């Protein structure tokens, strides 16, 4: 892209808009089938040597033309600007009323021409299926295909929707689909296509709030994981006092009077008790430490058995009857038979006693939305008039913030904040502001964020004698009835914490809702009501438009601005008036209410409008400061997230390669020699002495993990010229020979499929571990981050070592399993 962002971008887009407007009269001379022909033409031109960004003038013109024949609505110039910006990797701010559907249709058609697939992200399935079928007669009219992806849709149908030019779906399913696709065994099992372009309807929520939302799939294999019972089996060999089993201890702990430390904690700062668990039996007995990133998984498993012994006492902390585990509450004497402590805690208990061990419930597959949308090349979306955290768009997703002009001039009179001392003053001032407008015939919308104030203002309004209708969310039918005339002259509507966007309240009321209340609305009736409605609309205009009143403001300006943007629909008339008291909790956001107390000496004067604009500016400053503090926190959290993100991306790339390719002999053989070398180097050091070689250890390992019986002691005994290198190669050669011999019995193509599957399976198996391991270290690093060292940097270091170790273990078991397989080999 070229041209100064924002400033120059605005006029740059205008240059194209002019061309589109000039070519419009020409498009009106083109037949319906010609518009369709242009769409196909662009497809050909794109492969010929045409730039997508250069097709905008013609493409947008076709869309504008087609829309006039399909919907009869011409895409406004302001919409052309926004739709054009949505072709890049930027976020466009759209005012309430401009027309999101009439804007998002432009970038969709343009990017759809590439045939890569336009991924439209919706907040819910309602809008997803709504716009999908609504815009269908438009896109399909030009030849493009519209596909809808609903959560839970079968793979066959998904493939049809994903193979379409434009795909409508929810962010939730979008992420899950990606997970299922990447966790496939065969490339034909895929459901996705390409992450070329993504257009999200509301970034305010999906990109901001849902940024740190991880799609955790808890899909266990069930069965019976009796493997855990073999771990806890080593505990009864110890005594709770010394040698591993000890409730905290730390030398003393407490007196001999039921010293069961049920506060968990756990420590073992002696480093002499843990020495009893390590070594012997098998696994974690080779010489590995339990306080290493390459053994964090077992660390969180062995401690589970410990915190299931003296931590959870039988019959008091929990009760198991007939295999049914029920938690016993000692606080109020309650029994929880439908609950179980996660983090593998319940599993340790079920593995301690004669209970059937389950398959737990942890992260089988997970991905964060932020780490998902960041994979898309062209990531664009629409945002509301909220701003605030909008600055984080460039830091979280690296998107540029662009504002789109309104269709009509916004005549929303924004008034300053009138801060009073007591709530009585604040409320009374509101009543007065409303009462004065009740005589002028101006509709008043009270945005109470607190239910306590909603009833308070309602009682006060009744006291003064002012008509009012409260939007009780418990009665949607009531709300719809009020909203229909919420813009009616002198109509006081009270809203208790309204969600974003909201219904498009038309000034004067809604004749549609009026004619819909009649049995048979004839042409005469409709025209009559429209005539009356017209007068009602003009009346509100002379009154001052829709008057918004805010009793209390919100910390995050995102919601604050959302309420302010309720008026002036598509550039209409309105007035915003906010109030505040020294009793409201909002005065605590200024670091300390003691500071805000300086405003108590402003005079106030209940009944006199002090009108001080600097007050609003002060509040707005603090409002953005609150989120600035949150931003620092979000950044700190994302710091750890990106670490797992890169590792995930890396391992997913390798898994994808092995997924797409059919043959994997190259990889298998290349890692085969490496695995053997590493295993040999562990018993036989390079360029050492004969008496420095552990022949028995290597032989046993070969006859254990590689299923290869080789008498190395006999080989070197008769062949002294074997030296070392030749000896290593001999073992490898013999392995390859027997390997091929096993292969011939199973089948060449079959073995290749087997190896491919085993690689993916082993990778996935370790991936499940790594997912939990990352978490174990994520929280455990808090006790590892000492002074004179950054806890994030050290974490990344340990995480890198963990990943490396995982890779080594991957190649190890992959080659081992491929050899461990007991194939029925006949006498050759």
């Amino acid at each position: 892209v070229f041209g100064s962002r924002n400033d120059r971008t605005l006029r740059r887009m205008r240059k194209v808009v002019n061309i589109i407007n000039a070519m419009e009269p020409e498009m009106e001379k083109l037949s319906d089938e010609e518009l369709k022909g242009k769409t196909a033409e662009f497809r050909a031109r794109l492969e010929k040597g045409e730039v997508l960004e250069n097709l905008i003038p013609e493409a947008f013109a076709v869309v504008r033309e087609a829309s006039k024949r399909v919907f009869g609505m011409r895409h406004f110039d302001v919409q052309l600007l926004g739709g054009m910006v949505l072709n890049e990797r930027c976020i466009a701010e759209m005012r309430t009323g401009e027309g999101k559907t009439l804007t998002a249709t432009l970038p969709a058609y343009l990017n759809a021409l590439t045939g890569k697939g336009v991924h439209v992200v919706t907040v819910n399935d309602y809008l997803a299926q709504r716009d999908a079928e609504n815009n269908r007669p438009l896109f399909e009219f030009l030849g493009l295909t519209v596909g809808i992806n609903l959560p839970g849709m079968p793979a066959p149908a998904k493939r049809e929707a994903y193979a379409a030019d434009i795909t409508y779906g929810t962010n939730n399913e979008y992420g899950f689909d990606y997970l299922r696709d990447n966790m496939a065994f065969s490339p034909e099992e895929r459901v996705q296509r390409k992450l070329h372009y993504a257009l999200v309807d509301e970034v305010d929520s999906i990109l901001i709030d849902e940024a740190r939302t991880p799609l955790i799939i808890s899909g266990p294999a069930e069965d019976s994981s009796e493997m855990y019972k073999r771990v806890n089996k080593i505990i009864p060999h110890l005594i709770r006092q010394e040698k591993e089993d000890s409730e905290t201890f730390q030398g003393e702990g407490h007196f001999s009077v039921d010293e069961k430390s049920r506060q968990v904690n756990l420590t073992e700062r002696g480093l002499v008790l843990i020495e009893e668990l390590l070594v012997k039996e098998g696994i974690m007995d080779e010489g590995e430490s339990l306080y290493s990133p390459a053994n964090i998984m077992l660390m969180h498993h062995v401690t589970a058995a410990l915190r299931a012994h003296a931590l959870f006492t039988r019959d008091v902390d929990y009760i198991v009857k007939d295999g049914e585990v029920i938690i016993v509450d000692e606080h109020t004497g309650r029994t929880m038979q439908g609950r179980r402590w996660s983090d593998g805690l319940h599993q340790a208990v079920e593995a301690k006693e004669g209970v059937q061990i389950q398959n737990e419930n942890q992260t089988l597959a997970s991905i964060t939305f932020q780490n998902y949308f960041r994979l898309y090349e062209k990531l664009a979306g629409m945002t509301g008039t909220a701003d605030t955290e909008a600055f984080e768009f460039s830091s979280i997703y690296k998107l540029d913030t662009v504002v789109v002009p309104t269709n009509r001039p916004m005549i929303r009179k924004d008034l300053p904040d009138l801060v009073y001392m007591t709530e009585a003053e604040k409320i009374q001032a509101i009543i007065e502001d409303i009462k004065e407008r009740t005589a002028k015939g101006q509709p008043v919308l009270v945005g109470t964020i607190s239910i306590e104030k909603s009833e308070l203002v309602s009682n006060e309004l009744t006291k003064a004698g002012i008509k009012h209708n409260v939007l009780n969310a418990k009665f949607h039918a009531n709300e719809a009835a009020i909203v229909a005339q919420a813009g009616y002259p002198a109509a006081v509507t009270i809203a208790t914490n309204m969600a974003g966007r909201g219904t498009d309240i038309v000034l004067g009321g809604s004749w549609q809702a009026e004619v819909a209340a009649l049995e048979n609305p004839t042409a005469e009736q409709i025209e009559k009501i429209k005539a009356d409605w017209q007068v009602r609309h003009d009346a509100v205009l002379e009154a001052g438009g829709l008057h918004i009143i805010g009793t209390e403001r919100h910390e995050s300006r995102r919601i604050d601005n959302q309420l302010r943007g309720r008026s002036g629909r598509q550039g209409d008339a309105g007035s915003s008036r906010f109030y505040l008291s020294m009793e409201d909790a909002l005065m605590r956001i200024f670091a300390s209410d003691r500071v805000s107390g300086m405003m108590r000496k402003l005079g106030m004067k209940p009944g006199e409008a002090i009108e001080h604009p600097w007050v609003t500016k002060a509040i707005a400053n603090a409002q953005r400061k609150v989120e600035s503090r949150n931003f620092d926190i979000r950044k700190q959290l994302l710091e750890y997230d990106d670490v797992a993100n890169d590792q995930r991306r890396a391992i997913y790339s390798q898994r994808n390669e092995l997924l797409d390719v059919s043959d994997v002999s190259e990889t298998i053989n290349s890692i085969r020699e490496d695995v053997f070398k590493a295993t040999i180097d562990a018993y036989i050091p390079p360029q050492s002495l004969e008496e420095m070689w552990d022949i028995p250890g290597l032989q046993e390992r070969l006859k254990n993990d590689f299923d290869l019986d080789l008498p190395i002691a006999e080989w070197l005994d008769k062949e002294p010229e074997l030296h070392e290198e030749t000896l290593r190669e001999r073992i490898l050669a013999q392995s390859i020979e027997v390997y091929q011999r096993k292969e011939e019995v199973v089948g060449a193509e079959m073995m290749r499929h087997f190896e491919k599957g085993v690689m993916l399976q082993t990778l996935d198996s370790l991936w499940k571990e790594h997912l939990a391991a990352m978490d174990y270290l994520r929280q455990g690093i808090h006790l590892r981050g000492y002074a004179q060292k950054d806890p994030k940097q050290e974490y990344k270091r340990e995480s890198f070592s963990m990943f490396a170790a995982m890779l080594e273990s991957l190649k190890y078991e992959v080659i081992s399993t491929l050899s461990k397989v007991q194939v029925r080999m006949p006498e050759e």
Partner: peptide, 28 residues
């Protein structure tokens, strides 16, 4: 004779718990 006894029968059951969540199986 020299009876070299060793605990080669190590118990990887503790590790199998991690892969237990997605324990797929083929022919063997």
């Amino acid at each position: 004779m020299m009876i070299t006894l060793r605990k080669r029968r190590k118990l990887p059951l503790a590790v199998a718990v991690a892969a237990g969540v997605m324990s797929a199986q083929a022919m063997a």
